[PDB]
Amino acid sequence: AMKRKKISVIGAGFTGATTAFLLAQKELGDVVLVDIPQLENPTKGKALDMLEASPVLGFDANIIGTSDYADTADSDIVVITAGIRDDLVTTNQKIMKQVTKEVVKYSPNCYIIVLTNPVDAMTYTVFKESGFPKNRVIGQSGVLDTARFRTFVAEELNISVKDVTGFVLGGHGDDMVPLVRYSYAGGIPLEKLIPKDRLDAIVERTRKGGGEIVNLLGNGSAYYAPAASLVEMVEAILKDQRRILPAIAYLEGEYGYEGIYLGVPTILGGNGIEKVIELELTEEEKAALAKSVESVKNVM
Amino acid sequence: AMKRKKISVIGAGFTGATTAFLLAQKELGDVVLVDIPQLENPTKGKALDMLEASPVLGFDANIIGTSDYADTADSDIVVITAGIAMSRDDLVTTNQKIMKQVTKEVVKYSPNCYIIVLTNPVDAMTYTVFKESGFPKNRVIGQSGVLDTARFRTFVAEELNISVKDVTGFVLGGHGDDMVPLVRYSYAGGIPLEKLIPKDRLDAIVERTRKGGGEIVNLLGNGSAYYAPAASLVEMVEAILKDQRRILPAIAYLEGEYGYEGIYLGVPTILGGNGIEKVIELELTEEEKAALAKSVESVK
Amino acid sequence: AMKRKKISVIGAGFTGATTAFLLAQKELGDVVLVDIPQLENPTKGKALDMLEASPVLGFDANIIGTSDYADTADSDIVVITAGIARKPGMSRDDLVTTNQKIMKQVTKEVVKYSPNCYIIVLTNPVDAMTYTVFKESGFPKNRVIGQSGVLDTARFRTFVAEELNISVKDVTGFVLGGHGDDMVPLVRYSYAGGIPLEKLIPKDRLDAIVERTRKGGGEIVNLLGNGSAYYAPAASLVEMVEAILKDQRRILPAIAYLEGEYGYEGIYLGVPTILGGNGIEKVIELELTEEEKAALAKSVESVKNVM
Amino acid sequence: AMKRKKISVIGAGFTGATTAFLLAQKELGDVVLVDIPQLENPTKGKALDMLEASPVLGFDANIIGTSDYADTADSDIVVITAGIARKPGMSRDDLVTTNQKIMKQVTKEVVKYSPNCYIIVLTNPVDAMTYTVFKESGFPKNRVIGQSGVLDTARFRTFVAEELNISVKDVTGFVLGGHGDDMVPLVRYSYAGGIPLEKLIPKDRLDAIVERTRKGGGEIVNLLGNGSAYYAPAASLVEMVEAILKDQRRILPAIAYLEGEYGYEGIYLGVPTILGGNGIEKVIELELTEEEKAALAKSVESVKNV
Ligand SMILES: NC(=O)c1ccc[n+]([C@@H]2O[C@H](COP(=O)([O-])OP(=O)(O)OC[C@H]3O[C@@H](n4cnc5c(N)ncnc54)[C@H](O)[C@@H]3O)[C@@H](O)[C@H]2O)c1
Ligand SMILES: NC(=O)c1ccc[n+]([C@@H]2O[C@H](COP(=O)([O-])OP(=O)(O)OC[C@H]3O[C@@H](n4cnc5c(N)ncnc54)[C@H](O)[C@@H]3O)[C@@H](O)[C@H]2O)c1
Ligand SMILES: NC(=O)c1ccc[n+]([C@@H]2O[C@H](COP(=O)([O-])OP(=O)(O)OC[C@H]3O[C@@H](n4cnc5c(N)ncnc54)[C@H](O)[C@@H]3O)[C@@H](O)[C@H]2O)c1
Ligand SMILES: NC(=O)c1ccc[n+]([C@@H]2O[C@H](COP(=O)([O-])OP(=O)(O)OC[C@H]3O[C@@H](n4cnc5c(N)ncnc54)[C@H](O)[C@@H]3O)[C@@H](O)[C@H]2O)c1
């Protein structure tokens, strides 16, 4: 029988909830929205509120809220947005291990997309607790950074964001390794369209993208763009699209590094990470990536 | 020259934010997201988060947060979510002045717009906006029945295990005990629900629709519903921006219809290019006629 | 190992090519467009043309054209649009004789390479042709389904939308039985915004609307001069394919095998169904008037000649 | 009153009908299919067939068929897909002559009933057909545009995606000038997820992809036996229509009137443009290698000699 895909969203906060509503509107499958027992009810009300939109927007998806991982059984994809500095890492690292053990009990065959910061190490933890091969455990970072990058380049030139491309290796902030030489408008290199000063500010504003939103909102981090980035990565897997997207992936040789997670260009498909793509980098880029890999080792 | 539609959403909270993002997703137009000067930053931060999701989801729309009503200039549509956050006469009276204040800058900066009001009690608020605006009846509308039908349809769909797409609901009047549902004009794929769902189980679905708001409030712990209410507003914006001539329930101004006059009541409407194109009058029975009188009398 | 749904469309004529392009645009799966060997090159031309549209419309679907049924192996759904139209002056029996044969030859190769698929049949007359597919396939009944009422209700909703000047989204039609004289409309289960149409449209013009619905297929044939309708038919097939692939449990009129329903046994009839992941989940049994039971008994007399 | 956008599609054939159906499905506006008086019943038949799909696919649109240009009044956009039925003994030069005459007759009737429209031309040869539409219309240059480059880039992107086994969403092509031998691809400005294709695909296979792109229209003609491509050309048209009606400011290749751009004056040429609510907002001018200037110079010597 034809069965709907099943997506469990672990963490029913701003990000997990926006992600669930997006997945449901796109009819990508049934969504189980999961939080802690003391937020069980709020999670049931967000779910039921999303579901009550379905007649009007006109989508067929079941959306339920729960604190019982038995309800995530035989999930196809699990999105870990479950969050609460070296103490924070150790708290989130404790969560990741509690969550992952429940997840792979009930869904031994699922694919895991991790949003939890620092996503470099939060994913490594999932990967090691899960016991799953590296293709099945992925983290989000590069898509959000390229999303902010394209938005700034788009207002600068007064053109559709659809015709802007960014390229990002590494993590957020100072871990971020932009390749503005692989960044284009209409396929024209940006370095030919934006004077040096205005362009390096757009690169800086991308580095300070996540904080610019944390500053404006006052309480909590971004959720709209981050939810979009997870959905693009979910869609790439469920629909076996073989998208080329930057993701947090486990290296076993690529770019010289081994045994770590890092933001690299991948092919996202029905087998999860089909390939980590190896580019020829400049010495300036390899050096900026070596510094980034030093802050990934910094969170052991 | 072809110009985008401009939509301004007054109230950048839970409901207006969700409304703005849905409108942008569907490329219905440009969105200005409007709150009060002390919240101008977290508003600009929601608007920018949303706009940053545009590259990832593939929509061309601009979204700006403001506290300056000059930015809402030449709006095609204004949507009022401006809500207060205390007696039952306190919220009404406070919301009434908000409505007045908001409508005043709106009809100065966008003289020719259409207005859709969500702020509860919508029958009272929509009246205020209508009075302060000096616009004809067709150009000022509240949201209520779409959200009630959406709840009804969700519960019927679960009861029958069928798609929400093939469930109809029919409601006059407003929320709570002011709701006048006609189950006899409600169907699963054109089949009346009286013939498909027993008397007892159909009575409880209707009671659950009366208490639908409250059920989310209770589960949410703090604050009311937004996903389904945002969805309900976008359906009404779409019917107007695209001149669809939908038959939708809407809070409209009566002048002979159902025997009442000089009130805003939940009625079936043709919603099109001229907002309310016609108020539809059915042949009501006495137990429904009386139920509407008790609904008219409860809106005072 | 998340893999695309695979949909095979049999017949690369206007209805099958239109269907293929809609399925690919909606990313419902990978599409295999099949036709006879002599039309192999045209079939690949159409498929490659549709596929070259994918970067522009921004869908990820494979489309291929073939005359090799091995290319349809392990289809989740197979849509049959192969067969001839009833030419003016052609007898109904000649239409059935020719299409009966194509349905046996097509089903043979379909089930040879996709023993587990769902089958949706467009070929006319659809109760007779869906029955032939069922009996040839050896499939259980929930897996072999014909299109009829969706297309009849689509034309009905279009005419009524025009008469009342409202969106088609807010019109409901309701039809049992087949096309033409075989259609059994329930105007009393037909509404505008849930208001009965008998209360809104006077008797003469509503009767005209019902009669135009019966004649709708012939109206497009008369206007085209060269063949039959394809856009609305293709749309109707895609709505049924979606209901199944995405397990939607839609309530849709379908041509379904009855085993007691409506008091008929061992026939395909046009009835309200719930459509989902297991195909026909349920035939919905209605209480009909005696006029309705009679019109349905005349409609039945045309799959009885195929039993 | 909020009013629907209105689109007239001149020629209700394979490309015209395919385009009309995509425009209605997407809800970009009401659609008027126009053809010759003898083909008015076929045109109403397609229009009515499409409209009867609306309740099933869930779109609200008016679609009609006509032989009468009054039904096209106050169109926001006219798409020209009109061209003469290729008879057996039709001279290449006879065909271009007939079509040149169709463009003038069509354009005179269009600008009388829609003096404010934006016009997109598909009819081959599109550089010469679009110039003929421009000069008959009396409109300024930003409001008469040709389709060519989008279709070539669609075919290129399809073949690169096949070659690398990746999504077509993540492949980009760059093409100046016309179809076939007149095409000037810039593979150096062509990528897979931002990566130059020259680093991904060996030169012999990438040369062959380019050659398949030049030949891509004829590849479909050969397989079909009668007639030419219609699904990708319709899609290509609709992307350009959508970039105008929704003021998107897309960067797309279009057959655009040049007054100095690339050092040419008073010609239509395939060039990267910005496409928005005022039609062609900007012709984009690239720094070309002497080889690319020379390939383009040779491409312009085609546009003048037809
Ligand atoms: N990858 C990125 O670029 C990116 C961007 C934005 C957000 N983030 C990160 O995503 C995380 C969540 O963001 P948010 O705004 O949605 O946060 P939030 O605090 O609003 O929501 C987090 C949720 O996690 C839940 N949770 C905690 N422990 C749990 C457990 N054991 N089981 C189940 N649920 C549990 C909480 O109940 C809470 O509702 C944060 O770590 C944030 O920094 C990363
Ligand atoms: N029709 C329905 O059934 C329905 C459903 C849910 C919400 N609502 C109503 O809609 C309103 C908004 O609800 P919410 O959940 O978005 O609440 P919210 O408090 O999150 O949003 C209200 C926002 O309005 C802003 N605001 C107040 N006065 C303003 C003014 N004069 N100008 C501009 N902004 C102003 C506030 O600062 C706040 O951000 C409330 O009245 C709520 O009860 C109606
Ligand atoms: N329910 C309705 O009202 C409705 C609507 C329109 C068409 N139809 C049915 O659909 C059929 C096709 O419609 P169309 O407009 O595409 O006609 P068409 O003539 O364009 O298409 C029929 C195709 O079937 C192919 N075919 C024949 N035998 C075959 C075989 N053994 N294997 C594979 N392909 C084979 C033909 O080569 C042709 O390409 C009609 O004959 C009719 O029975 C039903
Ligand atoms: N890249 C491109 O720009 C591109 C690609 C493919 C098609 N084309 C061209 O598009 C044109 C249409 O191709 P098609 O396959 O749709 O052809 P078609 O023969 O199917 O349709 C052309 C239609 O134009 C109609 N027509 C003829 N004269 C007319 C007039 N005076 N007024 C109105 N309508 C008139 C015809 O009756 C016919 O129905 C051809 O010139 C073709 O070469 C160009």
CA distance D110 to D78: 8
- CA–centroid distance for C127 within its chain: 11
Closest CA to C56 of A93, D229, B160, D64: D229
B170 touches chain D (CB under 8 A): no
CA distance B295 to C168: 31
* Ligand 1 pocket residue status of A91, Cβ below 6 Å: no
- CA–centroid distance for D75 within its chain: 18
Q: Would you say D69 is a known binding-site residue?
A: yes
Q: Which atom of ligand 2 lies at the shortest distance from residue B16's CA?
A: 16
The residue to which tokens 């009855």 are assigned: C258
Q: Would you say B143 is a known binding-site residue?
A: yes
* Antiparallel, parallel or unpaired: β D250-259 and D265-276: antiparallel
CA distance D57 to C232: 9
Query: Which residue in A has a C-alpha nearest to residue D250's C-alpha?
Result: A160
CA distance B231 to B153: 14
Subunits next to D (3 or more Cβ pairs <8 Å) are A, B, C
Which H or E run contains A168? strand A168-170
Beta bridge partners of D97: none
C251 touches chain B (CB under 8 A): yes
Distance B252 CA to ligand 2 centre (A): 20
Which H or E run contains A203? helix A196-207
Please check whether residue C64 is in contact with residue C32, taking contact to mean a CB–CB distance below 8 angstroms. yes
Which H or E run contains D55? helix D40-57
CA distance D120 to A194: 31
Please check whether residue B67 is in contact with residue B34, taking contact to mean a CB–CB distance below 8 angstroms. yes
C250 touches chain D (CB under 8 A): no
Distance D81 CA to ligand 4 centre (A): 4
CA distance D302 to D125: 11
Query: Coil, helix or strand for D200?
Result: coil
Q: Which CATH architecture has domain A142-296?
A: Alpha-Beta Complex (3.90)
CA distance D192 to D206: 13
**Which residues of D belong to the active site?**
179
Phi, psi (deg, nearest 5) at residue B77: -140, 135
Q: Do A52 and B167 touch (CB under 8 A)?
A: no
CA distance B197 to B212: 20
Q: Would you say C270 is a known binding-site residue?
A: no
Angle between helices B40-52 and A224-238 (to 10 degrees): 20
CA distance B253 to B126: 9
Dmax of chain C from CA atoms?
Answer: 59
Long-range contacts of C102-109 (CB under 8 A, 24+ apart): C103/C129, C103/C132, C103/C133, C103/C136, C104/C132, C104/C136, C106/C10, C106/C80, C106/C82, C106/C133, C107/C80, C107/C132, C107/C133, C107/C136, C107/C137, C108/C136, C109/C69, C109/C72
Phi, psi (deg, nearest 5) at residue C287: -85, 110
The residue to which tokens 């429940």 are assigned: A102
- CA–centroid distance for A42 within its chain: 24
* Antiparallel, parallel or unpaired: β D118-121 and D144-146: parallel
Please check whether residue B262 is in contact with residue B137, taking contact to mean a CB–CB distance below 8 angstroms. no
Distance A209 CA to ligand 2 centre (A): 28
Residue spans of alpha helices (H) in chain D: 14-26, 40-57, 92-113, 126-137, 149-164, 203-214, 216-224, 231-245, 290-304
Please check whether residue C157 is in contact with residue C125, taking contact to mean a CB–CB distance below 8 angstroms. no
Neighbours of D280 (CB within 10 A): 22
CATH number of the B145-299 domain: 3.90.110.10
Query: Coil, helix or strand for A96?
Result: helix
Distance B94 CA to ligand 2 centre (A): 12
How many B×C Cβ pairs under 8 Å? 73
Q: Which residues contact A10 (CB under 8 A, 6 or more apart)?
A: A16, A34, A72, A78, A79, A80, A81, A82, A99, A103
Question: Which-ligand-closest: CA of C106?
Answer: 3
Interface test with B, best of C27, C246, C249 (most B CBs within 10 A): C249
Q: What is the token pair recorded at C9?
A: 């469309």
Q: Which CATH architecture has domain D149-303?
A: Alpha-Beta Complex (3.90)
CA distance C63 to C7: 10
Query: Which residue in D has a C-alpha nearest to residue C65's C-alpha?
Result: D223
Positive or negative torsion for Cα C250, C254, C260, C263: positive
The secondary structure of residue A116, as a DSSP letter, is -
Residue type, B247: I
Residue type, A279: L
Beta bridge partners of D34: D10, D66
* Antiparallel, parallel or unpaired: β A168-170 and A176-178: antiparallel
Q: Is B97 exposed, middle or buried (0-12, 13-18, 19+ CB in 10 A)?
A: exposed
* Ligand 1 pocket residue status of A18, Cβ below 6 Å: no
Q: Do D153 and C52 touch (CB under 8 A)?
A: no
B76 touches chain D (CB under 8 A): yes
- CA–centroid distance for D178 within its chain: 11
**Which residues of A belong to the active site?**
172
**For chain C, after which residues does the C atom lie more than 2.5 Å from the next written residue's N, i.e. where is it broken?**
none
Pocket-forming residues, ligand 4, beta carbon under 6 Å: D 10-16, 34-36, 39, 81-85, 102, 105-106, 122-124, 126, 147-148, 151, 227-230, 233
CA distance B53 to B85: 29
Neighbours of B58 (CB within 10 A): 15
Q: What is the token pair recorded at D93?
A: 């030069």
Phi, psi (deg, nearest 5) at residue B102: -65, -55
CA distance C126 to C240: 15
CA distance D270 to D276: 17
Residue type, C128: A
Closest CA to D126 of D152, D145, D106: D145
Which H or E run contains A40? helix A40-57
D107 touches chain C (CB under 8 A): no
Closest CA to D35 of D72, D86, D73: D72
A238 interaction partners in chain C (CB closer than 8 Å): 2
Residue type, B46: K
Which of C165, C189, C194 is the closest to B245 by Cβ? Answer: C165
CA distance B33 to B10: 6
Positive or negative torsion for Cα C161, C164, C165, C167: negative
Length of chain A: 300
* Ligand 1 pocket residue status of A79, Cβ below 6 Å: no
Q: Do C150 and D229 touch (CB under 8 A)?
A: no
Determine the distance in angstroms separating the CA of D290 from the nearest CA of chain C, rounded to an integer.
31
This structure's resolution (Å) is 2.3
The residue to which tokens 């004649």 are assigned: C215
Please check whether residue A171 is in contact with residue A178, taking contact to mean a CB–CB distance below 8 angstroms. no
Question: Which-ligand-closest: CA of C109?
Answer: 3
CA distance C264 to C142: 17
- How was this structure determined? It was done by X-ray
Query: Coil, helix or strand for C251?
Result: strand
Q: Which residues contact C54 (CB under 8 A, 6 or more apart)?
A: C24, C60, C61, C63, D154, D158, D168
Please check whether residue A191 is in contact with residue A180, taking contact to mean a CB–CB distance below 8 angstroms. yes
